[PDB]
Amino acid sequence: KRDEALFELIALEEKRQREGLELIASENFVSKQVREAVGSVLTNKYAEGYPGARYYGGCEVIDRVESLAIERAKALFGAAWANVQPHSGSQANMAVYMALMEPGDTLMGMDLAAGGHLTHGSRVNFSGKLYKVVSYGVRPDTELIDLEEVRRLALEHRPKVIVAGASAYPRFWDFKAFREIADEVGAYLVVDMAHFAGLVAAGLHPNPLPYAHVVTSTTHKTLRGPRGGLILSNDPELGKRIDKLIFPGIQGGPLEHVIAGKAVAFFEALQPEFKEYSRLVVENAKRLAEELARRGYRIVTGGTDNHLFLVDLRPKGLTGKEAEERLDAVGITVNKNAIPFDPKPPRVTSGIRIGTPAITTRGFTPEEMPLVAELIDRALLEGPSEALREEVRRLALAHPMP
Amino acid sequence: KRDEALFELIALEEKRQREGLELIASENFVSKQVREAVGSVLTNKYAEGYPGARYYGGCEVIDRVESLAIERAKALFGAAWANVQPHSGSQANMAVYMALMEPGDTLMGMDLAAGGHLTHGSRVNFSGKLYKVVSYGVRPDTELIDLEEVRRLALEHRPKVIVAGASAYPRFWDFKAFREIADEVGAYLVVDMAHFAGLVAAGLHPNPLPYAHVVTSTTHKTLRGPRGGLILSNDPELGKRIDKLIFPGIQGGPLEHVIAGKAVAFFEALQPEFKEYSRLVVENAKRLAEELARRGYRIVTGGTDNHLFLVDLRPKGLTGKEAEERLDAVGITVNKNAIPFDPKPPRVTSGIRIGTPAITTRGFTPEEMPLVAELIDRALLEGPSEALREEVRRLALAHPMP
Numbered sequence: 016k017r018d019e020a021l022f023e024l025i026a027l028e029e030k031r032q033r034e035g036l037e038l039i040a041s042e043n044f045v046s047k048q049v050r051e052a053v054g055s056v057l058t059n060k061y062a063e064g065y066p067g068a069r070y071y072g073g074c075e076v077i078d079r080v081e082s083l084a085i086e087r088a089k090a091l092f093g094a095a096w097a098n099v100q101p102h103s104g105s106q107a108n109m110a111v112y113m114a115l116m117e118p119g120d121t122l123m124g125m126d127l128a129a130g131g132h133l134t135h136g137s138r139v140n141f142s143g144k145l146y147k148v149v150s151y152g153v154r155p156d157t158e159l160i161d162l163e164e165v166r167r168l169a170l171e172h173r174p175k176v177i178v179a180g181a182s183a184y185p186r187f188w189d190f191k192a193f194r195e196i197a198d199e200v201g202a203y204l205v206v207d208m209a210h211f212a213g214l215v216a217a218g219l220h221p222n223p224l225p226y227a228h229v230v231t232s233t234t235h236k237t238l239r240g241p242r243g244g245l246i247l248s249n250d251p252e253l254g255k256r257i258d259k260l261i262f263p264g265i266q267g268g269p270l271e272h273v274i275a276g277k278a279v280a281f282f283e284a285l286q287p288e289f290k291e292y293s294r295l296v297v298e299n300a301k302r303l304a305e306e307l308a309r310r311g312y313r314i315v316t317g318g319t320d321n322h323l324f325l326v327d328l329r330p331k332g333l334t335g336k337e338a339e340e341r342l343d344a345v346g347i348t349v350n351k352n353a354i355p356f357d358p359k360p361p362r363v364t365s366g367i368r369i370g371t372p373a374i375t376t377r378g379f380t381p382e383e384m385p386l387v388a389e390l391i392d393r394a395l396l397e398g399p400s401e402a403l404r405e406e407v408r409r410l411a412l413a414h415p416m417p
Numbered sequence: 418k419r420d421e422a423l424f425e426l427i428a429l430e431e432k433r434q435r436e437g438l439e440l441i442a443s444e445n446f447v448s449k450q451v452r453e454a455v456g457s458v459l460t461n462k463y464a465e466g467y468p469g470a471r472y473y474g475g476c477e478v479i480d481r482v483e484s485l486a487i488e489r490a491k492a493l494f495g496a497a498w499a500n501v502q503p504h505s506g507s508q509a510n511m512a513v514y515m516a517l518m519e520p521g522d523t524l525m526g527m528d529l530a531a532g533g534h535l536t537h538g539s540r541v542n543f544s545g546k547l548y549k550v551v552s553y554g555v556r557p558d559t560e561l562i563d564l565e566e567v568r569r570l571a572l573e574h575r576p577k578v579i580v581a582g583a584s585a586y587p588r589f590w591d592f593k594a595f596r597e598i599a600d601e602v603g604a605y606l607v608v609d610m611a612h613f614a615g616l617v618a619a620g621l622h623p624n625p626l627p628y629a630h631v632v633t634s635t636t637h638k639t640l641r642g643p644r645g646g647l648i649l650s651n652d653p654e655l656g657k658r659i660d661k662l663i664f665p666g667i668q669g670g671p672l673e674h675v676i677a678g679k680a681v682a683f684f685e686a687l688q689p690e691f692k693e694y695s696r697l698v699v700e701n702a703k704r705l706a707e708e709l710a711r712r713g714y715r716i717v718t719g720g721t722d723n724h725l726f727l728v729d730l731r732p733k734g735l736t737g738k739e740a741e742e743r744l745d746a747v748g749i750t751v752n753k754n755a756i757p758f759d760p761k762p763p764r765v766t767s768g769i770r771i772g773t774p775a776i777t778t779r780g781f782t783p784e785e786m787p788l789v790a791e792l793i794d795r796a797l798l799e800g801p802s803e804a805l806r807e808e809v810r811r812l813a814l815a816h817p818m819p
């Protein structure tokens with residue numbers, strides 16, 4: 016018997032995805048073939064260990080699949096070693112931290128409020144629970160990272176690991192500078208490129224591989240792959256240690272169906288078409304930010320170098336919470352985000368974060384950003400209305416999903 | 418462009434699965450609908466947080482999907498609370514340990530050599546790295562757990578957490594007694610039912626819910642669901658604490674497509690047909706163990722109460738590794754496994770573990786176990802040969818696949 020109650024919900028979710036504008040920066044829409052791989056029979060195989068060194072018989076084909084994912088990841092990112100088994104970006108970071116540190120050691124990462132991720136040191140996360148944490152943010156006068164301050168903090172706190180990368184930072188990273196700082200204090204530099212991995216793959220964002228000791232990432236987000244994690248490095252010896260932390264360290268059986276999906280995603284990203292997609296993602300973000308600025312909003316840092324940007328809602332007297340609600344009411348999904356030194360508490364905020372990967376995948380182009388900006392502005396100024404919700408629905412439907 | 422190379426590999430794995438006898442105790446074959454859910458568009462939604470308490474909007478449908486999985490898990494196992502977000506059985510255990518203990522606390526579990534899982538205290542696993550581990554085993558004469566011995570170990574070491582359940586123990590567990598022991602030292606009793614969860618759901622194995630403080634499990638294995646984890650408890654308040662450890666504690670975004678698959682698997686397990694399936698799983702295991710015993714193989718504990726059993730190959734002059742390889746050579750897949758008081762190192766072992774969940778799903782019946790036993794025996798005695806390989810292939814192909 017078919018589980019009709021569950022499948023009725025999946026149909027509803029498909030409809031929801033088709034009829035709204037997804038502007039959450041960490042979202043995207045995977046291809047039908049990525050889904051085909053993830054929904055494959057590869058889930059039936061227990062394959063603890065690594066290719067050619069498994070703890071179960073019958074892994075001959077799974078080994079070819081995982082090796083393919085590994086080799087493609089190395090070719091795509093110009094890496095010498097890769098681990099494609101992390102179940103998520105969080106597990107990728109967890110394995111790396113445990114391979115480079117012991118509980119009690121000091122971890123340095125970007126403050127959550129400044130754009131850092133929970134796994135970069137939050138007290139409610141394993142990162143802050145297992146390690147002592149020192150955080151860096153952005154300057155009040157520039158809204159950008161202050162390398163001089165990062166260096167000062169590193170020298171004073173002597174972290175064992177320094178993490179570069181974030182979930183809500185709209186500009187490029189100076190990986191060379193971070194590595195120089197790490198070397199000065201004898202710390203490992205870990206770059207978490209989860210958000211901008213697709214841009215790195217497309218050659219549209221500085222490549223952290225040569226500068227970081229280890230690079231972690233999600234396979235979803237700008238890379239547009241299945242939900243999961245990834246680890247890369249130019250140091251195979253260090254890679255061997257990290258492999259041991261993924262298994263038997265923190266995971267058991269890998270999700271080989273998802274690994275097959277990662278291989279497919281890497282195949283897609285290796286095609287010239289992915290660079291064109293990525294160029295449009297960045298152009299769309301830059302243009303949408305400009306169009307919103309022209310309509311009366313302020314953009315944190317004045318713009319963006321990547322796929323996302325932060326809108327300062329203060330010029331129009333709105334809070335991030337209010338903006339998120341009004342937009343949600345008309346079918347546009349964004350998320351509130353604190354602006355630098357936000358005068359409002361975290362549960363309220365004075366801004367919202369917008370990212371273009373998802374709508375770009377659905378066919379939105381730069382010349383359509385003025386319209387998107389207008390719809391966003393109308394929702395925030397007039398508030399929700401049936402007419403606006405339906406205009407958004409029609410626009411979304413006119414841009415079919417993969 | 419289609420990733421032909423990757424899909425050709427998936428086709429080869431489908432072929433491998435169709436033409437061999439998969440006897441790995443922890444494997445199974447998921448249904449087409451479980452695969453359909455896992456390969457759904459639900460992977461495109463970031464749902465950090467919990468139903469009705471998400472970080473981002475747009476989870477209206479996702480919440481109903483996760484909630485359906487939660488309520489079905491509760492109904493299936495008679496639990497007051499459930500967390501369906503763990504990415505794997507390992508993450509389920511990791512979250513529970515971190516919710517109940519602080520690094521350095523004493524963790525008591527079953528010795529790996531006696532049947533315990535690596536997450537029950539292995540020195541190279543997070544369990545043994547973060548906590549001080551003490552382990553209980555089985556009696557050398559009966560190869561069964563001695564509750565009095567377990568009680569003495571608990572009183573001596575005063576563990577904060579005692580884990581009952583294992584990945585390679587062929588007999589029933591006295592959960593009531595384990596709870597009494599935990600209570601004697603004020604420890605939390607955690608039951609890891611990953612291997613026998615399906616049997617518990619079918620009412621063919623003692624249910625740990627009333628006695629354990631917390632129950633962890635995989636959704637794959639005897640439960641025959643998608644690859645992932647699960648946590649249950651008879652105490653909703655303790656559940657609230659554990660929810661915080663899964664997120665924001667050790668994970669980020671949950672795999673909602675997999676959670677949809679969990680809902681489907683729970684639906685399937687709630688059907689009367691699942692009880693019949695589970696009955697056949699146990700009957701097949703008992704009969705296959707008997708058939709091998711009649712061929713001179715020594716079965717640990719002399720038989721089994723569940724879906725798996727261990728074969729001590731020392732008398733046959735074969736190591737577990739050699740046996741695993743010989744069988745794999747003719748399409749019969751198993752995994753080497755240590756035997757109680759095994760003299761050989763883990764990398765070699767003196768035995769193999771066999772389980773019937775997978776072949777039972779394909780339609781194998783107790784009356785066919787005499788033939789399976791013959792093929793296993795011949796593979797170990799005569800070694801690989803195209804002739805034997807073909808006989809295995811024929812028997813396998815005589816059974817359809819989910």
Ligand SMILES: *Cc1c(COP(=O)(O)O)cnc(C)c1O
Nearest residue numbers: 103104105132181182209669670
């Ligand atoms: C998204 C993200 C993660 C975590 O990934 P999950 O798959 O949600 O566990 C970690 N670090 C950064 C910088 C991220 O953007």
Ligand SMILES: *Cc1c(COP(=O)(O)O)cnc(C)c1O
Nearest residue numbers: 267268505506507534583584611
């Ligand atoms: C299978 C198993 C696990 C781990 O599950 P993974 O999904 O492989 O991480 C943990 N404990 C027990 C008893 C298991 O059988």
